Design a protein around this ligand. Structure first.
Ligand SMILES: *[C@@H]1O[C@H](CO)[C@@H](O)[C@H](O)[C@H]1NC(C)=O
Lengths: 175, 55
């Protein structure tokens, strides 16, 4: 999309990730599984909830009876009343249709941005320790157990702790 | 022209008498005097819905 991640360099979504909108997939000796990034997902839920409530709650009306009744010699004001009713209809129909179109595009872009930013955060943490193998995936140059995975998903990855082990494996494999 | 077998006609009028005011009817004929009036307090808004939808 606008940020190139959803339906972009990350081609498809995950049906096996049920606890959030954005997240991770890992695999090591101990197995594999899916986990949502709770921080980014909760921000998106807060933003989208606010976006929905704003579109609805900013419409506050007063008590009003639209209808009017006119006799056979009041045709001009009857048509004037019809013009007012039709004019509001056209304004509200046009604005409502376009607001939905424009906000849907921005919402899909917003989700695309979040997935893009999540990938970039991980890439900035891992640096040389992992290889970008495409499709939003990193393949480590050092074994990364469940505890190591939790550090990445929590943003507490210790690059120097594995930097030398990754360096040796990176330098051999590239020789 | 006959409408409901009547070649005559009858016009209907109404007025709102403010509290404490007086209304006088005087005639030498042709007057359909009031018998029941209505003391009332108007609201603001609402209208008349014309429909077969049930209450
Ligand atoms: C995850 O990161 C937060 C950052 O504030 C830290 O406080 C927390 O201890 C980390 N989780 C674990 C299990 O260490």
């Amino acid at each position: 999309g606008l940020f190139g991640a959803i339906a972009g360099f990350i081609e498809g979504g995950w049906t096996g990730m049920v606890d959030g909108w954005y997240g991770y997939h890992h695999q090591n000796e101990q197995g594999s599984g899916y986990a949502a990034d709770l921080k980014s997902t909760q921000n998106a839920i807060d933003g989208i909830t606010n976006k929905v409530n704003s579109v609805i709650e900013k419409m506050n009306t007063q008590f009003t009876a639209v209808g009017k009744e006119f006799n056979h010699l009041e045709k001009r004001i009857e048509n004037l009343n019809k013009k007012v009713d039709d004019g509001f209809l056209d304004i509200w129909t046009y604005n409502a249709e376009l607001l939905v179109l424009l906000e849907n595009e921005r919402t899909l872009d917003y989700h695309d941005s979040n997935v893009k930013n999540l990938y970039e955060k991980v890439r900035s943490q891992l640096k040389n320790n992992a290889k970008e193998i495409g499709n939003g995936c990193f393949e480590f140059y050092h074994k990364c157990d469940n505890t190591c995975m939790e550090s990445v998903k929590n943003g507490t990855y210790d690059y120097p702790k594995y930097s030398e082990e990754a360096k040796l494996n990176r330098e051999e494999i590239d020789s | 022209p006959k409408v409901r077998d009547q070649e005559g006609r009858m016009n209907y009028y109404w007025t709102l008498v403010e509290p404490g005011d007086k209304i006088t009817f005087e005639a030498t004929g042709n007057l359909v005097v009031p018998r029941y009036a209505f003391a009332m307090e108007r609201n603001a808004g609402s209208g008349i819905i014309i429909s077969d939808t049930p209450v």
